[PDB]
Design a protein around this ligand. Structure first.
Ligand SMILES: [Fe+3]
Ligand SMILES: [Fe+3]
Ligand SMILES: [Fe+3]
Ligand SMILES: [Fe+3]
Ligand SMILES: [Mg+2]
Ligand SMILES: [Mg+2]
Ligand SMILES: [Mg+2]
Ligand SMILES: [Mg+2]
Lengths: 172, 172, 172, 172
């Protein structure tokens, strides 16, 4: 048992390892999305940049959780990172819709993690989740919502004009 | 009853006065440790500096709790500050081990304080402890554990080269 | 068939996708290693830093292959990223020995990729591997050899002093 | 026989002269395309600018091959530069499609040149082609591919709004 460990439940430790894996998975999804938009037959450069930025941020989310595990005296156990659900993400709008679903999935996982920390009376872990993760998810969800709404109102996915102009004027 | 007091239980008020006393005691422990390393027969200047810095920080932790007590309309009651458990702290490794035990002790007090504040439905006080104290303790405990690990692996306390080089390369 | 595709064999495309997976795997190994050295019972922060930098580099290696795949009109197919072979990397020296073995493994894969590109008379792809990958591996392999040699000469992994001082003076 | 000539086959010398002619021809095609877009009845200034830039770059490509010919001790023999295939390039999309076709034609010639240099064991000439020509062609092809995709998706060449907006937002 770690010399630093204090008020850190075995279940919380295990839940943090699950969250790490999910953050790395989210990173991988966004990587896949990015390079879809880099294809010569899709060629929406600012969609690509937008998704690659998200990829890199997900990796930071994972790293901070790995730091937390070690700070609290848990032990990191890494797992296979599952490949994304799609190879072809279809359109700007469909990608954004899939991203919104991903962020809500990740948010639900974090809310389950907070429920467990609350049950185990771990206020440091509650604070960690609240400070560094929950508002990030609320902001990401709201932004993705806004993006999906605009793309739909502009006439996407059907109007190819719509994705081109959104790429330029919102994501540029 | 103070004109400012709202949702602040008498038990929380008393627990904050206990915490103030404990922060002042931790300050005094670290002061004693610092001046041990300043002795001509110990002479590890960066151990001394490390512990003196911790002493000053604990005094700040004490003052912020005093500020909080007054903010919430409680009344400060100071007690004798107990002398540290030792006069002679033996070695840099033993002082680091005692510092780790002390920080875990203060952390357990803050967790009990948070449990009480949760019980009394005092979210302002919960937030105060999480925001200013809990992560500070986690970082301190992790750092002290890291230091103990290194000193032991280096071959302390028998190898006096170990303490000299750690003083120079880690604490310098 | 992609409107940009020219002189780009289906076997080369498939081999690039295999290489992308291997670069992402190496990124994950180095991530694992990094956070091992961040543990409170290992506590070698420059080893952690060194392996984290290598992890981020590997991800860039992957992204550049993904870019090349799209430039040549191939199609990216991502796969599960397998977890590293170990959870616990034992020591600074043993981690460095495993990194050396990993870099040799990546290098052999790049040499097979070049053999294939040569056989398919793809000078662009040959140039790409030579310019961006082959010398980078040779440098990495030489540096890891140098590190292994020094740690061994210093007395690692039995001497914990050796790892401490190598962390400070070579990696810091 | 030039006092500088070494390992430079007469067939390679001849193929460099053919390449110079093709680069100058590409320069002329792009010049033609540029001033089509300058017409008062076409009036797409950023298409004009884009194609004039390419024209000037093709001339640089020609000059660097003339320099190479002299460096290796070959003798430059210039030929008539044939007029481009069209006088009227129809539209922004059709001009981009023709430019993609032209760049692939130039690329195929460079690959045939590299095959010849490889057969005559001329690594210097192989390196020259890879370093200065092959990746430049791959980037040009990918960029033209990207432009064609976007113009098509925006609804060109039917939608005159599409070419106007593309001229402003992508080529401006
Ligand atoms: Fe995340
Ligand atoms: Fe304190
Ligand atoms: Fe690599
Ligand atoms: Fe050219
Ligand atoms: Mg709370
Ligand atoms: Mg908070
Ligand atoms: Mg070669
Ligand atoms: Mg080369």
């Amino acid at each position: 048992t770690s010399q630093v460990r204090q008020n850190y439940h075995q279940d919380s430790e295990a839940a943090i390892n699950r969250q790490i894996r999910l953050e790395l998975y989210a990173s991988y999804v966004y990587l896949s999305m990015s390079y879809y938009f880099d294809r010569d037959d899709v060629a929406l450069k600012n969609f690509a940049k937008y998704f690659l930025h998200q990829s890199h941020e997900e990796r930071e989310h994972a790293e901070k959780l790995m730091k937390l595990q070690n700070q609290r005296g848990g032990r990191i156990f890494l797992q296979d990172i599952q490949k994304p659900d799609k190879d072809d993400w279809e359109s700007g709008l469909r990608a954004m819709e899939k991203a919104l679903k991903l962020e809500k999935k990740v948010n639900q996982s974090l809310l389950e993690l907070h429920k467990l920390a609350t049950k185990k009376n771990d206020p440091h872990l509650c604070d960690f989740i609240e400070t560094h993760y929950l508002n990030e998810q609320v902001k990401a969800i709201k932004e993705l919502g806004d993006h999906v709404t605009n793309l739909r109102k502009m006439g996407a996915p059907r109007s190819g004009l719509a994705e081109y102009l959104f790429d330029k004027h919102t994501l540029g």
